[PDB]
Amino acid sequence: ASPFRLASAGEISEVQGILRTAGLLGPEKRIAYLGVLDPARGAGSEAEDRRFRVFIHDVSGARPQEVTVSVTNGTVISAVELDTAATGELPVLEEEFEVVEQLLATDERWLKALAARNLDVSKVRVAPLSAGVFEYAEERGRRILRGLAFVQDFPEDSAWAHPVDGLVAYVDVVSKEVTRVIDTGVFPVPAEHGNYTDPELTGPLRTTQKPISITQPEGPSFTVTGGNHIEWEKWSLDVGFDVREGVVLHNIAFRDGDRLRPIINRASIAEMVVPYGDPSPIRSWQNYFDTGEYLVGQYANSLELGCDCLGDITYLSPVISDAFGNPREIRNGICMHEEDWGILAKHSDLWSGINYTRRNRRMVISFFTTIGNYDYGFYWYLYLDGTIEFEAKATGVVFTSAFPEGGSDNISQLAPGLGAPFHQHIFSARLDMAIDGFTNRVEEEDVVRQTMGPGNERGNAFSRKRTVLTRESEAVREADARTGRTWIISNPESKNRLNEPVGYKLHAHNQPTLLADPGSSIARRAAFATKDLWVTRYADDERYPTGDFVNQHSGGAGLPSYIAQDRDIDGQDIVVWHTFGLTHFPRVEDWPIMPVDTVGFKLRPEGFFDRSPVLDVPAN
Amino acid sequence: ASPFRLASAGEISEVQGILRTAGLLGPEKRIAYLGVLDPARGAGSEAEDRRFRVFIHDVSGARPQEVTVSVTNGTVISAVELDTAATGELPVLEEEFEVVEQLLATDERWLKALAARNLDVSKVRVAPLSAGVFEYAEERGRRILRGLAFVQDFPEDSAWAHPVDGLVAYVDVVSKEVTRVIDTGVFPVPAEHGNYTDPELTGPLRTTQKPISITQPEGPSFTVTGGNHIEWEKWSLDVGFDVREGVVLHNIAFRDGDRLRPIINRASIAEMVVPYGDPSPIRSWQNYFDTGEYLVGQYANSLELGCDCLGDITYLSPVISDAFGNPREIRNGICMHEEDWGILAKHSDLWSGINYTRRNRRMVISFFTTIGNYDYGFYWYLYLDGTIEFEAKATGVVFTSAFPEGGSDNISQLAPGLGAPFHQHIFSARLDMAIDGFTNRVEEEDVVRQTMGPGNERGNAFSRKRTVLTRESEAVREADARTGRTWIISNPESKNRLNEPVGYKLHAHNQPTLLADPGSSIARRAAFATKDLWVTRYADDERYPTGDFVNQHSGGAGLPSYIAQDRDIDGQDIVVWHTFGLTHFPRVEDWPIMPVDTVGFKLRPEGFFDRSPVLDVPAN
Ligand SMILES: [NH3+]CCc1ccccc1
Ligand SMILES: [NH3+]CCc1ccccc1
Ligand SMILES: [Cu+2]
Ligand SMILES: [Cu+2]
Ligand code: NA
Ligand code: NA
């Protein structure tokens, strides 16, 4: 009976009924987002109200609505008409993916461009790309997608190998109008195929790999109760799923003796953005927010035993709503399992004669999503020693273009005539902290170098300094790999046995943040991505670093507007937002299908325990 | 019959005989180092000469010697008397470990200090620490170790829990003289024990972990021929072992179609150093070079099946010489096995309908070493996609002190009265590069940010720049995480099918380098550690970044003297030296035995292949 339980098919069927009865789900309506709301702060009075938030699109041009529903009470709580010129358009609908291709396929300007390139319109796929906000005044308040074309030689052909460069179109998907067709010149369509299952390309498959068998002859070491509550090796948590964010972790806690100690209240990847660095007008508008614009959870893959997840796997199958409010099960959408992780601790002592070795392991919670050409795995790891780690795995097919004759400073060449524009993959982790409870503070820790002199006569000393972040206006922080900069989240009212505040240290990878010019449209809309670390005071409605409606929003929403409140964060209920990402200069080896590359972050205990928390691990 | 084969017991027995007959191994002699020499450059004329380098110490005060021997020809090639005031002392001998304790145990000044603290001399262990070079003129040319004391309450007690602070002694281990005893004040000896196998400390062991079984029902996928030649998943290499460096990788190559393509000629960890940042005169001299002063290979552990290495393990048992020239087998000293490594590549395509998933794996070559309180695992990883990775795993027991009343800026508190001085663990990887052959160059690659303006009107463009390093004097490089700085090793005379030079990219972790003041003794002796990247022209005798004789050398030897030759490195036979390390502010969780922390680097192909090299991997 947990309030953090997954949404059930029955709850979603009741939401649909409530919306229908209220007159909010007519035939011109589509559900663009549906998700359970987290319990409010201080629900410890026991009063379960299962509430759902719904974004409702209207395919006839009427104003969309934001609606909150209580399945517990069977009522509509609020329903607001949205002015989308003001607050942003709703997320892209799956059914709009093919509308862009179909509308262009009858437009004379589009047919004119394809005819000059001798392309059969029935072979031309059109990627449905988010539009952003640029110079085009006619787009304000309209639902616009932009289309870039790729040729499929036959139904099983990889279209990404055949970009049609020098051509882009803009489409109003509600009025079904093609607003602009821009043809800047003919580029040869790259001819080589990129079919990575074609024996002519792969050659004979390897016969040298032989099997690795990972089994757990006595089950797994974790238990799952109430559908989504995990207990594993003193860890406790709830695994949630949201159609926008994907896997969400709730109530991460560690059982230290007889005390259950909270660490993180809610952990999610709350936004991601892929900005492209090609200045060609064909692509210079291209930045897609996979989380905020497309909703990564609704494209989660069904994960296959032995291929996607290997070992003794426990699956979760989350339920989401389709565009009409029917429940849709994502079969085997979340994989969970434990993994051997090498040596945990080891010492052979010359004086005591004792040899000691212990092995480590980790709990893995993962899902995969596919949005167009790109595929990402999201992995959360819990380790025996208290460490928490997130890892994103990027794979799929790189987004392509022509490679210009005479080269390019912003595109790399992958095959004859075929290019891949430079781009970044930037994530925002939202960590609603609860280190031993909700009274937390953040300190920035830098290494301090000391000069040779009095008190340091051999010039060997070095130290560290910690700076408390006391107000939101000073809590927008940059990495500094030079000085070993980390951030410590501590509880000043909870001390370890040495009388020091208990804490956790965040270790970043220190990769570059957003490279775009600070005056650009993307720097305004993805402002979170320009800094490595933000800290805010918790608030119910401050969910996403980019705001609630990312699609076609003019910018400034989210983190820069939250922190302007300049709230007290020194020993308060706080949220850490960590930006981290990959800067991708594509290489030949990324083609025709890209080997996984990774990025992430980790948190390690910092005086949270009174000694090593893994002294009670047995000797295998 | 490979020239890169491991040394055999028979070869070492012949070396001993040759040395004995030549009069070089009398009863006052000790072998401080013995190791096989790599074949000279251009031995492709086929002429095997197995040669060994030997450092010979004299326990009676005579001058040590460096000797080269050919077991092939049964002769002494050269024998040089060493002036150790000039070129450095020989590495610490294992038999000198207990000489420091035994000599102090009869010194009246030492007994005076223990008596005032009411310590029974039979309970006091003395750590044998390398001396470095500081202000003491009487030490030049003498073989000095310094001693710090720890109390063992009973034979199985962990002495590290009971440091005797405020007390240090210096010992001449050849003349058997205690040169100085420094007592700066009495500190309480910390009373809590740190016995991590005591049920009173651990509590009841966990009963919740249940087994993970990793098996390979058909063997392993790699083959071992000639004792130490590995073939695995198109990779080819030789696994060497040296008593100073430990595991060395030779002739790393990748079978691309019908061509065997070299990548790295020799890879090793050529030095490591642990500098302490406590300005107390009791410890301000403390910096130990585990590789150069103590020789990490001779302390390699015998690795246990199921505890140290899990799965289907193939072992190597390298042979080294003891101090008298007898062969000594390190049973099960090197573990090798392959490991599942998650998803390699994955894409589900919306237009072609093809779902594609492939799994990754890695080849692991590892050993563990223990020198006093510290334990390290060295791991080399080869991946299916051409990636090479090194990982160091640091564990064991932290070096301790008293925690001063009133605190400290350079020591953290681990238990009542017990401190752990700040320190670093810094490694030097020596990578004798051979990217498609020996004509290589290094480029530094930085991200380039571009301003909004003409040619970049939306302010989204970004680029990269590469700077060729042409001469040694310009090849001393610093990290820059901000700008995503990496280094590319390429072969300008070997091009991929796109006509670009083939290459590999080095990705660093960008951790802080040496923090000590640049005018300090350690900055002079560990000059390699002050910069992230060095490139030299290959030379036979340029083996270690610190020089051949690190112990008590006054500084400047090694890399700073090599690069002063200012040799051409633009398309030549070059060696990359990468500094990387951990800065350790010890935490409570590191006590009484430290959970593993890690650091390393990786190299990934950068246009080395003509497309993804893993298209021929099967579907499991
Ligand atoms: N990831 C969102 C961008 C996208 C969407 C659909 C096809 C190709 C690219
Ligand atoms: N790691 C070399 C320093 C050392 C050597 C022996 C005991 C304790 C410390
Ligand atoms: Cu990418
Ligand atoms: Cu350390
Ligand atoms: Na919080
Ligand atoms: Na070389």
PDB file of N, CA and C in Angstrom, chain B residues 252-319:
ATOM      1  N   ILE B 252      51.612  -4.994 -28.214  1.00  0.00           N
ATOM      2  CA  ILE B 252      50.159  -4.940 -28.305  1.00  0.00           C
ATOM      3  C   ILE B 252      49.791  -4.636 -29.747  1.00  0.00           C
ATOM      4  N   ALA B 253      49.020  -5.530 -30.357  1.00  0.00           N
ATOM      5  CA  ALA B 253      48.671  -5.424 -31.762  1.00  0.00           C
ATOM      6  C   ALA B 253      47.255  -5.938 -31.961  1.00  0.00           C
ATOM      7  N   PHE B 254      46.649  -5.516 -33.065  1.00  0.00           N
ATOM      8  CA  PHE B 254      45.265  -5.834 -33.383  1.00  0.00           C
ATOM      9  C   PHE B 254      45.205  -6.379 -34.801  1.00  0.00           C
ATOM     10  N   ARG B 255      44.548  -7.524 -34.968  1.00  0.00           N
ATOM     11  CA  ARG B 255      44.462  -8.202 -36.263  1.00  0.00           C
ATOM     12  C   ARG B 255      43.276  -7.625 -37.027  1.00  0.00           C
ATOM     13  N   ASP B 256      43.554  -6.734 -37.966  1.00  0.00           N
ATOM     14  CA  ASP B 256      42.512  -6.045 -38.728  1.00  0.00           C
ATOM     15  C   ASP B 256      42.465  -6.699 -40.105  1.00  0.00           C
ATOM     16  N   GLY B 257      41.514  -7.608 -40.294  1.00  0.00           N
ATOM     17  CA  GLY B 257      41.475  -8.404 -41.505  1.00  0.00           C
ATOM     18  C   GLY B 257      42.620  -9.393 -41.527  1.00  0.00           C
ATOM     19  N   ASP B 258      43.493  -9.277 -42.520  1.00  0.00           N
ATOM     20  CA  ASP B 258      44.671 -10.123 -42.618  1.00  0.00           C
ATOM     21  C   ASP B 258      45.940  -9.430 -42.140  1.00  0.00           C
ATOM     22  N   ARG B 259      45.850  -8.160 -41.747  1.00  0.00           N
ATOM     23  CA  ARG B 259      46.991  -7.376 -41.289  1.00  0.00           C
ATOM     24  C   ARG B 259      47.051  -7.371 -39.765  1.00  0.00           C
ATOM     25  N   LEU B 260      48.217  -7.694 -39.218  1.00  0.00           N
ATOM     26  CA  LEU B 260      48.495  -7.488 -37.800  1.00  0.00           C
ATOM     27  C   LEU B 260      49.046  -6.076 -37.635  1.00  0.00           C
ATOM     28  N   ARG B 261      48.297  -5.212 -36.951  1.00  0.00           N
ATOM     29  CA  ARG B 261      48.681  -3.812 -36.854  1.00  0.00           C
ATOM     30  C   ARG B 261      49.175  -3.492 -35.453  1.00  0.00           C
ATOM     31  N   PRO B 262      50.420  -3.049 -35.290  1.00  0.00           N
ATOM     32  CA  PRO B 262      50.903  -2.689 -33.954  1.00  0.00           C
ATOM     33  C   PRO B 262      50.197  -1.447 -33.436  1.00  0.00           C
ATOM     34  N   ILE B 263      50.091  -1.366 -32.108  1.00  0.00           N
ATOM     35  CA  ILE B 263      49.515  -0.200 -31.449  1.00  0.00           C
ATOM     36  C   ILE B 263      50.495   0.306 -30.390  1.00  0.00           C
ATOM     37  N   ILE B 264      50.907  -0.563 -29.474  1.00  0.00           N
ATOM     38  CA  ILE B 264      51.827  -0.181 -28.407  1.00  0.00           C
ATOM     39  C   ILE B 264      52.946  -1.210 -28.329  1.00  0.00           C
ATOM     40  N   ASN B 265      54.186  -0.723 -28.345  1.00  0.00           N
ATOM     41  CA  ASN B 265      55.340  -1.613 -28.266  1.00  0.00           C
ATOM     42  C   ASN B 265      55.585  -2.104 -26.843  1.00  0.00           C
ATOM     43  N   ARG B 266      55.503  -1.205 -25.862  1.00  0.00           N
ATOM     44  CA  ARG B 266      55.688  -1.566 -24.465  1.00  0.00           C
ATOM     45  C   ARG B 266      54.855  -0.639 -23.594  1.00  0.00           C
ATOM     46  N   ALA B 267      54.103  -1.228 -22.670  1.00  0.00           N
ATOM     47  CA  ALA B 267      53.283  -0.473 -21.727  1.00  0.00           C
ATOM     48  C   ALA B 267      53.606  -0.918 -20.310  1.00  0.00           C
ATOM     49  N   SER B 268      53.888   0.041 -19.432  1.00  0.00           N
ATOM     50  CA  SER B 268      54.196  -0.298 -18.058  1.00  0.00           C
ATOM     51  C   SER B 268      53.812   0.874 -17.171  1.00  0.00           C
ATOM     52  N   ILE B 269      53.661   0.587 -15.885  1.00  0.00           N
ATOM     53  CA  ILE B 269      53.682   1.627 -14.870  1.00  0.00           C
ATOM     54  C   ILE B 269      55.143   1.741 -14.434  1.00  0.00           C
ATOM     55  N   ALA B 270      55.819   2.821 -14.841  1.00  0.00           N
ATOM     56  CA  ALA B 270      57.269   2.908 -14.689  1.00  0.00           C
ATOM     57  C   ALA B 270      57.703   3.563 -13.393  1.00  0.00           C
ATOM     58  N   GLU B 271      56.779   4.189 -12.657  1.00  0.00           N
ATOM     59  CA  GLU B 271      57.100   4.754 -11.350  1.00  0.00           C
ATOM     60  C   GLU B 271      55.797   5.023 -10.611  1.00  0.00           C
ATOM     61  N   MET B 272      55.857   5.022  -9.281  1.00  0.00           N
ATOM     62  CA  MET B 272      54.751   5.600  -8.524  1.00  0.00           C
ATOM     63  C   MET B 272      55.334   6.258  -7.290  1.00  0.00           C
ATOM     64  N   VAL B 273      54.643   7.253  -6.764  1.00  0.00           N
ATOM     65  CA  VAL B 273      55.159   7.975  -5.607  1.00  0.00           C
ATOM     66  C   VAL B 273      53.987   8.338  -4.711  1.00  0.00           C
ATOM     67  N   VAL B 274      54.200   8.277  -3.392  1.00  0.00           N
ATOM     68  CA  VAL B 274      53.180   8.680  -2.426  1.00  0.00           C
ATOM     69  C   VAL B 274      53.766   9.799  -1.573  1.00  0.00           C
ATOM     70  N   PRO B 275      53.543  11.062  -1.930  1.00  0.00           N
ATOM     71  CA  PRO B 275      53.991  12.185  -1.096  1.00  0.00           C
ATOM     72  C   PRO B 275      52.983  12.557  -0.017  1.00  0.00           C
ATOM     73  N   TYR B 276      53.493  12.821   1.187  1.00  0.00           N
ATOM     74  CA  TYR B 276      52.653  13.204   2.314  1.00  0.00           C
ATOM     75  C   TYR B 276      52.678  14.717   2.509  1.00  0.00           C
ATOM     76  N   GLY B 277      51.537  15.272   2.899  1.00  0.00           N
ATOM     77  CA  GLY B 277      51.374  16.713   3.008  1.00  0.00           C
ATOM     78  C   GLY B 277      51.282  17.218   4.441  1.00  0.00           C
ATOM     79  N   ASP B 278      51.873  16.481   5.381  1.00  0.00           N
ATOM     80  CA  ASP B 278      51.876  16.873   6.790  1.00  0.00           C
ATOM     81  C   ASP B 278      53.175  17.608   7.084  1.00  0.00           C
ATOM     82  N   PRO B 279      53.141  18.871   7.513  1.00  0.00           N
ATOM     83  CA  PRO B 279      54.390  19.613   7.728  1.00  0.00           C
ATOM     84  C   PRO B 279      55.101  19.291   9.033  1.00  0.00           C
ATOM     85  N   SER B 280      54.560  18.405   9.860  1.00  0.00           N
ATOM     86  CA  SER B 280      55.256  18.018  11.083  1.00  0.00           C
ATOM     87  C   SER B 280      56.635  17.451  10.742  1.00  0.00           C
ATOM     88  N   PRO B 281      57.692  17.852  11.450  1.00  0.00           N
ATOM     89  CA  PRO B 281      59.015  17.251  11.194  1.00  0.00           C
ATOM     90  C   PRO B 281      59.047  15.742  11.377  1.00  0.00           C
ATOM     91  N   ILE B 282      58.091  15.168  12.107  1.00  0.00           N
ATOM     92  CA  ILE B 282      58.009  13.715  12.235  1.00  0.00           C
ATOM     93  C   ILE B 282      57.737  13.046  10.885  1.00  0.00           C
ATOM     94  N   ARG B 283      57.029  13.726   9.974  1.00  0.00           N
ATOM     95  CA  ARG B 283      56.629  13.103   8.711  1.00  0.00           C
ATOM     96  C   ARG B 283      56.878  13.952   7.467  1.00  0.00           C
ATOM     97  N   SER B 284      57.426  15.165   7.601  1.00  0.00           N
ATOM     98  CA  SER B 284      57.500  16.070   6.454  1.00  0.00           C
ATOM     99  C   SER B 284      58.508  15.629   5.398  1.00  0.00           C
ATOM    100  N   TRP B 285      59.356  14.651   5.704  1.00  0.00           N
ATOM    101  CA  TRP B 285      60.299  14.042   4.777  1.00  0.00           C
ATOM    102  C   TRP B 285      59.686  12.860   4.027  1.00  0.00           C
ATOM    103  N   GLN B 286      58.442  12.481   4.336  1.00  0.00           N
ATOM    104  CA  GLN B 286      57.930  11.167   3.948  1.00  0.00           C
ATOM    105  C   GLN B 286      57.379  11.203   2.523  1.00  0.00           C
ATOM    106  N   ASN B 287      58.067  10.518   1.607  1.00  0.00           N
ATOM    107  CA  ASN B 287      57.605  10.286   0.239  1.00  0.00           C
ATOM    108  C   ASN B 287      58.171   8.952  -0.191  1.00  0.00           C
ATOM    109  N   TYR B 288      57.347   7.959  -0.484  1.00  0.00           N
ATOM    110  CA  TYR B 288      57.971   6.711  -0.880  1.00  0.00           C
ATOM    111  C   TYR B 288      57.595   6.414  -2.322  1.00  0.00           C
ATOM    112  N   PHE B 289      58.600   5.994  -3.091  1.00  0.00           N
ATOM    113  CA  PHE B 289      58.426   5.549  -4.471  1.00  0.00           C
ATOM    114  C   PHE B 289      58.312   4.035  -4.409  1.00  0.00           C
ATOM    115  N   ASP B 290      57.087   3.518  -4.419  1.00  0.00           N
ATOM    116  CA  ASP B 290      56.947   2.075  -4.254  1.00  0.00           C
ATOM    117  C   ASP B 290      57.640   1.327  -5.393  1.00  0.00           C
ATOM    118  N   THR B 291      57.498   1.823  -6.629  1.00  0.00           N
ATOM    119  CA  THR B 291      58.154   1.176  -7.761  1.00  0.00           C
ATOM    120  C   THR B 291      59.670   1.358  -7.715  1.00  0.00           C
ATOM    121  N   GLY B 292      60.141   2.605  -7.683  1.00  0.00           N
ATOM    122  CA  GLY B 292      61.569   2.856  -7.835  1.00  0.00           C
ATOM    123  C   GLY B 292      62.417   2.550  -6.612  1.00  0.00           C
ATOM    124  N   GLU B 293      61.860   2.709  -5.412  1.00  0.00           N
ATOM    125  CA  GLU B 293      62.641   2.463  -4.203  1.00  0.00           C
ATOM    126  C   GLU B 293      62.460   1.049  -3.658  1.00  0.00           C
ATOM    127  N   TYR B 294      61.253   0.485  -3.741  1.00  0.00           N
ATOM    128  CA  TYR B 294      60.972  -0.796  -3.101  1.00  0.00           C
ATOM    129  C   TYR B 294      60.784  -1.956  -4.069  1.00  0.00           C
ATOM    130  N   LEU B 295      60.439  -1.682  -5.339  1.00  0.00           N
ATOM    131  CA  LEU B 295      60.236  -2.669  -6.405  1.00  0.00           C
ATOM    132  C   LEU B 295      58.918  -3.422  -6.215  1.00  0.00           C
ATOM    133  N   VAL B 296      57.854  -2.987  -6.904  1.00  0.00           N
ATOM    134  CA  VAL B 296      56.528  -3.508  -6.563  1.00  0.00           C
ATOM    135  C   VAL B 296      56.378  -4.966  -6.968  1.00  0.00           C
ATOM    136  N   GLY B 297      57.102  -5.405  -8.000  1.00  0.00           N
ATOM    137  CA  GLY B 297      56.922  -6.764  -8.477  1.00  0.00           C
ATOM    138  C   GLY B 297      57.370  -7.818  -7.479  1.00  0.00           C
ATOM    139  N   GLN B 298      58.359  -7.505  -6.652  1.00  0.00           N
ATOM    140  CA  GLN B 298      58.824  -8.543  -5.740  1.00  0.00           C
ATOM    141  C   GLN B 298      57.878  -8.757  -4.577  1.00  0.00           C
ATOM    142  N   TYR B 299      56.885  -7.884  -4.396  1.00  0.00           N
ATOM    143  CA  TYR B 299      55.897  -8.045  -3.342  1.00  0.00           C
ATOM    144  C   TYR B 299      54.541  -8.465  -3.891  1.00  0.00           C
ATOM    145  N   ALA B 300      54.500  -8.954  -5.128  1.00  0.00           N
ATOM    146  CA  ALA B 300      53.247  -9.433  -5.702  1.00  0.00           C
ATOM    147  C   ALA B 300      52.652 -10.557  -4.857  1.00  0.00           C
ATOM    148  N   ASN B 301      51.336 -10.503  -4.660  1.00  0.00           N
ATOM    149  CA  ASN B 301      50.606 -11.532  -3.926  1.00  0.00           C
ATOM    150  C   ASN B 301      50.382 -12.771  -4.787  1.00  0.00           C
ATOM    151  N   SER B 302      50.267 -13.917  -4.125  1.00  0.00           N
ATOM    152  CA  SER B 302      49.688 -15.100  -4.746  1.00  0.00           C
ATOM    153  C   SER B 302      48.174 -14.946  -4.733  1.00  0.00           C
ATOM    154  N   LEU B 303      47.541 -14.956  -5.910  1.00  0.00           N
ATOM    155  CA  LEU B 303      46.119 -14.624  -6.003  1.00  0.00           C
ATOM    156  C   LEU B 303      45.252 -15.877  -5.926  1.00  0.00           C
ATOM    157  N   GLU B 304      44.224 -15.827  -5.075  1.00  0.00           N
ATOM    158  CA  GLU B 304      43.401 -16.988  -4.740  1.00  0.00           C
ATOM    159  C   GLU B 304      42.172 -17.078  -5.639  1.00  0.00           C
ATOM    160  N   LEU B 305      41.932 -18.271  -6.176  1.00  0.00           N
ATOM    161  CA  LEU B 305      40.742 -18.533  -6.971  1.00  0.00           C
ATOM    162  C   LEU B 305      39.479 -18.259  -6.160  1.00  0.00           C
ATOM    163  N   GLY B 306      38.526 -17.554  -6.770  1.00  0.00           N
ATOM    164  CA  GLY B 306      37.262 -17.256  -6.128  1.00  0.00           C
ATOM    165  C   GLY B 306      37.273 -16.095  -5.158  1.00  0.00           C
ATOM    166  N   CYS B 307      38.438 -15.711  -4.628  1.00  0.00           N
ATOM    167  CA  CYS B 307      38.541 -14.556  -3.742  1.00  0.00           C
ATOM    168  C   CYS B 307      39.161 -13.357  -4.452  1.00  0.00           C
ATOM    169  N   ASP B 308      40.367 -13.528  -5.015  1.00  0.00           N
ATOM    170  CA  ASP B 308      41.037 -12.452  -5.733  1.00  0.00           C
ATOM    171  C   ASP B 308      40.619 -12.386  -7.193  1.00  0.00           C
ATOM    172  N   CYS B 309      40.477 -13.533  -7.836  1.00  0.00           N
ATOM    173  CA  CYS B 309      40.075 -13.609  -9.227  1.00  0.00           C
ATOM    174  C   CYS B 309      38.912 -14.587  -9.322  1.00  0.00           C
ATOM    175  N   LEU B 310      37.828 -14.151  -9.958  1.00  0.00           N
ATOM    176  CA  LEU B 310      36.567 -14.882  -9.989  1.00  0.00           C
ATOM    177  C   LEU B 310      36.207 -15.192 -11.428  1.00  0.00           C
ATOM    178  N   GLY B 311      35.856 -16.442 -11.693  1.00  0.00           N
ATOM    179  CA  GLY B 311      35.512 -16.836 -13.042  1.00  0.00           C
ATOM    180  C   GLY B 311      36.471 -17.891 -13.542  1.00  0.00           C
ATOM    181  N   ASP B 312      36.617 -18.001 -14.852  1.00  0.00           N
ATOM    182  CA  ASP B 312      37.545 -18.959 -15.450  1.00  0.00           C
ATOM    183  C   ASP B 312      38.903 -18.279 -15.601  1.00  0.00           C
ATOM    184  N   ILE B 313      39.832 -18.601 -14.705  1.00  0.00           N
ATOM    185  CA  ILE B 313      41.088 -17.867 -14.558  1.00  0.00           C
ATOM    186  C   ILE B 313      42.233 -18.687 -15.139  1.00  0.00           C
ATOM    187  N   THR B 314      43.064 -18.048 -15.952  1.00  0.00           N
ATOM    188  CA  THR B 314      44.363 -18.589 -16.322  1.00  0.00           C
ATOM    189  C   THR B 314      45.436 -17.818 -15.561  1.00  0.00           C
ATOM    190  N   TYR B 315      46.324 -18.539 -14.892  1.00  0.00           N
ATOM    191  CA  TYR B 315      47.359 -17.925 -14.074  1.00  0.00           C
ATOM    192  C   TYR B 315      48.702 -17.929 -14.787  1.00  0.00           C
ATOM    193  N   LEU B 316      49.510 -16.915 -14.490  1.00  0.00           N
ATOM    194  CA  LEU B 316      50.938 -16.929 -14.770  1.00  0.00           C
ATOM    195  C   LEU B 316      51.662 -16.885 -13.440  1.00  0.00           C
ATOM    196  N   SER B 317      52.784 -17.604 -13.354  1.00  0.00           N
ATOM    197  CA  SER B 317      53.594 -17.673 -12.142  1.00  0.00           C
ATOM    198  C   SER B 317      54.988 -17.185 -12.505  1.00  0.00           C
ATOM    199  N   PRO B 318      55.251 -15.886 -12.392  1.00  0.00           N
ATOM    200  CA  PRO B 318      56.561 -15.369 -12.802  1.00  0.00           C
ATOM    201  C   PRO B 318      57.650 -15.757 -11.820  1.00  0.00           C
ATOM    202  N   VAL B 319      58.870 -15.830 -12.342  1.00  0.00           N
ATOM    203  CA  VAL B 319      60.054 -16.183 -11.568  1.00  0.00           C
ATOM    204  C   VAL B 319      60.912 -14.937 -11.430  1.00  0.00           C
TER     205      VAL B 319
END
